[PDB]
Amino acid sequence: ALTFPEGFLWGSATASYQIEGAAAEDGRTPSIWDTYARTPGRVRNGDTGDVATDHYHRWREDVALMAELGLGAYRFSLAWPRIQPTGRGPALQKGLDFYRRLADELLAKGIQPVATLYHWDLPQELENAGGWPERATAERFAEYAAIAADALGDRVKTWTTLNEPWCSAFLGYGSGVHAPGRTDPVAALRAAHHLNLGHGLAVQALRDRLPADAQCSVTLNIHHVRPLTDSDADADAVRRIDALANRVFTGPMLQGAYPEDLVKDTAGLTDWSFVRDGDLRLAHQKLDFLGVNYYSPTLVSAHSPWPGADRVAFHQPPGETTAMGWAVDPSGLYELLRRLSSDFPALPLVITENGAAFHDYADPEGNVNDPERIAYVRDHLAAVHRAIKDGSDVRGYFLWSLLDNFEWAHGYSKRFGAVYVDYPTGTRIPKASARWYAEVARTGVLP
Amino acid sequence: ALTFPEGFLWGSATASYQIEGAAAEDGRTPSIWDTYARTPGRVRNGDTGDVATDHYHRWREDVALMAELGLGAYRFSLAWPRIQPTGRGPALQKGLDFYRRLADELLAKGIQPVATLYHWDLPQELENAGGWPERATAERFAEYAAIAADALGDRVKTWTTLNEPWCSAFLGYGSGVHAPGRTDPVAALRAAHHLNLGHGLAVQALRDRLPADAQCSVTLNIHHVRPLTDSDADADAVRRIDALANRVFTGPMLQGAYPEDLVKDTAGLTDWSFVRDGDLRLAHQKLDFLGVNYYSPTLVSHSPWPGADRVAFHQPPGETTAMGWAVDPSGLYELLRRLSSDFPALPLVITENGAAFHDYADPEGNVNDPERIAYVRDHLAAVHRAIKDGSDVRGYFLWSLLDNFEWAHGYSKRFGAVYVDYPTGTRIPKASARWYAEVARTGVLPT
Ligand SMILES: OC[C@H]1O[C@@](CO)(O[C@H]2O[C@H](CO)[C@@H](O)[C@H](O)[C@H]2O)[C@@H](O)[C@@H]1O
């Protein structure tokens, strides 16, 4: 039985388009994912987030559920399309009101609201104007950040600018398997840069409009890259992928510069002239903690999500697999945390996303048993505890996700929730893992 | 497009314990599967068929769906536990009445009732007395056949004695992964013989109590065994498994003799003294057609394969289903060609073919299963080729009309053309249901 540090934060996480629904209600206009999902062949079975879990209408019930589970924090994302339809123009108060009431209720329940400004639902109009590969998008994001802070700054004290920019840039503009579905290596790199720029401009805006005690962060899915063999070549492959997966973001955001090896690796693709003088300084803002997302390790040896790394081959890491077919290896989380502690010793860490998809089902008696999820979470929490014992400054853990939801290109075919959702009715059924996690959250002890 | 013979029969199939529920109503007492499911660790998540799809109560709705889908036949099994609780004594009219009403409803809507006498739900009392390894069970089964024929003979004109005796004998008494859960190679072989015997005695009883035009059959899951390599050693492994999986039943049932190689292969286990004088002639009864069940190929190079410890099994190449089984329609084509070669004068009916996929109902209440449509279409194409090449196949039954209790897998695997939300029992015809209906209506297979 492992005991976690005093004050360790126990929460769950969700994203706006994945759970809200009410896609065309109260002033919300389409995001790139609305467009993408409605495009034949882009999302499994043509699923869309039109309704999803209907959280927009069931929000009060969901907060009550969080309270019953004894969670200390709730990480959610703000829908740019609801707050500032089209990505420009004035704030839409009706949109902000949804988050005002949500945040107020969370606080009334003693649950800390943690808001992510951008979790992929870019207003379609901004993509029409060029999307992330277009510089203006970064400036538009900073204006949106100010709008959000002005409206919710008095109730929300923990802010995250972006969630997994690697996915937005490389899957969104590199391999095109995520909205908006474009496939151009240079567009992907430009997108990555403007996400770095937007992030910095947003933190600047947040610091200026939020109370002095407010916390600001960014959430990155830190790939833990390992080599297939001891070969010197495979070690170079690890470097290349680490550069593209992590350092293209941690470099600018946490060090104020793009890694030189990355620039060299991509020299045949671009000269990075879109990096205007001063952009790196703006991207490099002081953060209160780094949000880390992790699910599985990476093993290595024009339409790719890895511009310039065509020589690299990827392999299935060893271990049992989840419904995503991803390997289950908690050692990757431990090693990843140690790497971060070594590279950024003074930066506190928070696991903002970790969880697993399994083929859950409600039986005739109305129960949803997911012992596999309990095992996955338990094992990964053990790895986190071990990293902490070894010196890593980890301050919290957020289980992706409180609810089964729209898992992007997979549609509703993949269930990650602690709480099962019967989509046709919207009925929530806490799974066995919800009851187990609630105990961990209430005792701070991992059995 | 491929056009099937205008007289080709199109149906769907189910089994009593898998769909009925009402496990303790109207006099029904525990079958070996009720007992097995109640045993910790035997069935996924402790699932049981106590409620299942609640078909015992909602059957009228299911027959209505079949009619809506234009199916020409419905294959179902009779629950011995409902008809004769202890496996002997007075037949319960309430039990018989359920099936009489069901058969009448099917006929009223132009659907041909096809009844299977035994689909694994052996009355517990018969197991307490020895189960299938005990000869009396075969005798009791034949007396049960007469009871069923007397009560339903005026309505049901197509009868099947046993469904997949290989599973009953070897999974039930060999590896113990199926009810009753015993693990004894000799018990498994004795069970196999008594299933062979019971089958024959039942056919005799059916022929005696049914109208002259009634048809009798047996359903066997015929394993299509292939060797990993072209070695003679692998070829012999194929022979050994083919003997244990198929010929241990086809030999006695269709040829009046156990294959000599099987007797040799098992000489270290038994001398088959339980095979009494006259037993082979009894097992060898003329049938109107052979029911064939097929899902995936078998690749070879406590066990359910007595005397075959020198054989290893491998994952056959191809896409996989939720069961992890390889999808290979060529196995069905080849299997049919072999049966046509071995038993040319014996008509064939595909009594079971289908696939499990991780289906879900989306927010709009739809269940899309294009993977199942592809599976069925591909296998039907294989059947059509077999027919064109000379195989006498006269019907096809999609396992299963409904998602149901999939034995040791519990409710974790969905095979239905119709989705079932277990907590409510709500039925939602999947995309495959509408697609299959079109095929069953015109007999035209769109490729
Ligand atoms: O020395 C940079 C250091 O101070 C912070 C405030 O704590 O930000 C200032 O410096 C930036 C870089 O020149 C400006 O872009 C920003 O507006 C300004 O307040 C931190 O972000 C940084 O770590």
PDB file of all heavy atoms in Angstrom, chain A residues 204 281-282 284-286, ligand 1:
ATOM      1  N   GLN A 204       1.004  35.262 -21.367  1.00  0.00           N
ATOM      2  CA  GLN A 204       1.216  36.688 -21.121  1.00  0.00           C
ATOM      3  C   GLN A 204      -0.113  37.352 -20.783  1.00  0.00           C
ATOM      4  O   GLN A 204      -0.220  38.109 -19.816  1.00  0.00           O
ATOM      5  CB  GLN A 204       1.792  37.372 -22.360  1.00  0.00           C
ATOM      6  CG  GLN A 204       3.286  37.575 -22.342  1.00  0.00           C
ATOM      7  CD  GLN A 204       3.752  38.454 -23.485  1.00  0.00           C
ATOM      8  OE1 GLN A 204       4.873  38.961 -23.474  1.00  0.00           O
ATOM      9  NE2 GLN A 204       2.891  38.634 -24.483  1.00  0.00           N
ATOM     10  N   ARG A 281      11.142  34.130 -27.737  1.00  0.00           N
ATOM     11  CA  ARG A 281      11.092  34.781 -26.433  1.00  0.00           C
ATOM     12  C   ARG A 281       9.652  34.826 -25.925  1.00  0.00           C
ATOM     13  O   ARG A 281       9.390  34.608 -24.739  1.00  0.00           O
ATOM     14  CB  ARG A 281      11.646  36.210 -26.527  1.00  0.00           C
ATOM     15  CG  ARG A 281      11.607  36.979 -25.213  1.00  0.00           C
ATOM     16  CD  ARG A 281      12.297  38.332 -25.332  1.00  0.00           C
ATOM     17  NE  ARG A 281      11.610  39.255 -26.236  1.00  0.00           N
ATOM     18  CZ  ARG A 281      10.530  39.964 -25.914  1.00  0.00           C
ATOM     19  NH1 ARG A 281      10.001  39.862 -24.701  1.00  0.00           N
ATOM     20  NH2 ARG A 281       9.987  40.785 -26.806  1.00  0.00           N
ATOM     21  N   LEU A 282       8.717  35.104 -26.828  1.00  0.00           N
ATOM     22  CA  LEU A 282       7.309  35.175 -26.449  1.00  0.00           C
ATOM     23  C   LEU A 282       6.760  33.801 -26.070  1.00  0.00           C
ATOM     24  O   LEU A 282       5.938  33.682 -25.163  1.00  0.00           O
ATOM     25  CB  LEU A 282       6.486  35.783 -27.593  1.00  0.00           C
ATOM     26  CG  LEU A 282       6.846  37.230 -27.949  1.00  0.00           C
ATOM     27  CD1 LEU A 282       6.115  37.651 -29.211  1.00  0.00           C
ATOM     28  CD2 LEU A 282       6.489  38.150 -26.790  1.00  0.00           C
ATOM     29  N   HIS A 284       8.424  31.422 -24.683  1.00  0.00           N
ATOM     30  CA  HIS A 284       9.062  31.011 -23.429  1.00  0.00           C
ATOM     31  C   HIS A 284       8.620  31.764 -22.173  1.00  0.00           C
ATOM     32  O   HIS A 284       9.327  32.654 -21.690  1.00  0.00           O
ATOM     33  CB  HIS A 284      10.582  31.139 -23.583  1.00  0.00           C
ATOM     34  CG  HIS A 284      11.361  30.554 -22.445  1.00  0.00           C
ATOM     35  ND1 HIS A 284      12.687  30.856 -22.220  1.00  0.00           N
ATOM     36  CD2 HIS A 284      11.008  29.670 -21.482  1.00  0.00           C
ATOM     37  CE1 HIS A 284      13.117  30.184 -21.167  1.00  0.00           C
ATOM     38  NE2 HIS A 284      12.118  29.457 -20.700  1.00  0.00           N
ATOM     39  N   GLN A 285       7.466  31.391 -21.627  1.00  0.00           N
ATOM     40  CA  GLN A 285       6.944  32.043 -20.431  1.00  0.00           C
ATOM     41  C   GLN A 285       7.041  31.144 -19.201  1.00  0.00           C
ATOM     42  O   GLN A 285       6.993  29.916 -19.308  1.00  0.00           O
ATOM     43  CB  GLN A 285       5.485  32.449 -20.650  1.00  0.00           C
ATOM     44  CG  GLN A 285       5.267  33.420 -21.802  1.00  0.00           C
ATOM     45  CD  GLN A 285       6.056  34.703 -21.646  1.00  0.00           C
ATOM     46  OE1 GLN A 285       6.204  35.223 -20.538  1.00  0.00           O
ATOM     47  NE2 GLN A 285       6.560  35.226 -22.756  1.00  0.00           N
ATOM     48  N   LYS A 286       7.170  31.763 -18.030  1.00  0.00           N
ATOM     49  CA  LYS A 286       7.275  31.019 -16.779  1.00  0.00           C
ATOM     50  C   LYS A 286       5.954  30.327 -16.472  1.00  0.00           C
ATOM     51  O   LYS A 286       4.896  30.950 -16.510  1.00  0.00           O
ATOM     52  CB  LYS A 286       7.638  31.966 -15.628  1.00  0.00           C
ATOM     53  CG  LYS A 286       8.030  31.276 -14.321  1.00  0.00           C
ATOM     54  CD  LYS A 286       8.543  32.315 -13.320  1.00  0.00           C
ATOM     55  CE  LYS A 286       9.246  31.689 -12.117  1.00  0.00           C
ATOM     56  NZ  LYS A 286       8.332  31.373 -10.986  1.00  0.00           N
TER      57      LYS A 286
HETATM   58  O1  LIG C   1      12.878  36.973 -17.727  1.00  0.00           O
HETATM   59  C1  LIG C   1      11.728  36.318 -18.334  1.00  0.00           C
HETATM   60  C2  LIG C   1      10.809  35.760 -17.217  1.00  0.00           C
HETATM   61  O2  LIG C   1       9.866  36.726 -16.617  1.00  0.00           O
HETATM   62  C3  LIG C   1       8.540  36.511 -17.129  1.00  0.00           C
HETATM   63  C4  LIG C   1       7.637  36.930 -15.921  1.00  0.00           C
HETATM   64  O3  LIG C   1       7.980  36.157 -14.756  1.00  0.00           O
HETATM   65  O4  LIG C   1       8.044  37.294 -18.226  1.00  0.00           O
HETATM   66  C5  LIG C   1       8.523  38.509 -18.731  1.00  0.00           C
HETATM   67  O5  LIG C   1       9.457  38.244 -19.672  1.00  0.00           O
HETATM   68  C6  LIG C   1       9.094  37.826 -21.032  1.00  0.00           C
HETATM   69  C7  LIG C   1      10.270  37.558 -21.989  1.00  0.00           C
HETATM   70  O6  LIG C   1      10.958  38.785 -22.360  1.00  0.00           O
HETATM   71  C8  LIG C   1       7.994  38.731 -21.627  1.00  0.00           C
HETATM   72  O7  LIG C   1       7.542  38.141 -22.863  1.00  0.00           O
HETATM   73  C9  LIG C   1       6.838  38.769 -20.582  1.00  0.00           C
HETATM   74  O8  LIG C   1       5.843  39.613 -21.056  1.00  0.00           O
HETATM   75  C10 LIG C   1       7.330  39.321 -19.289  1.00  0.00           C
HETATM   76  O9  LIG C   1       6.484  39.479 -18.156  1.00  0.00           O
HETATM   77  C11 LIG C   1       8.562  34.984 -17.350  1.00  0.00           C
HETATM   78  O10 LIG C   1       7.631  34.606 -18.331  1.00  0.00           O
HETATM   79  C12 LIG C   1       9.986  34.591 -17.752  1.00  0.00           C
HETATM   80  O11 LIG C   1      10.325  33.341 -17.257  1.00  0.00           O
END
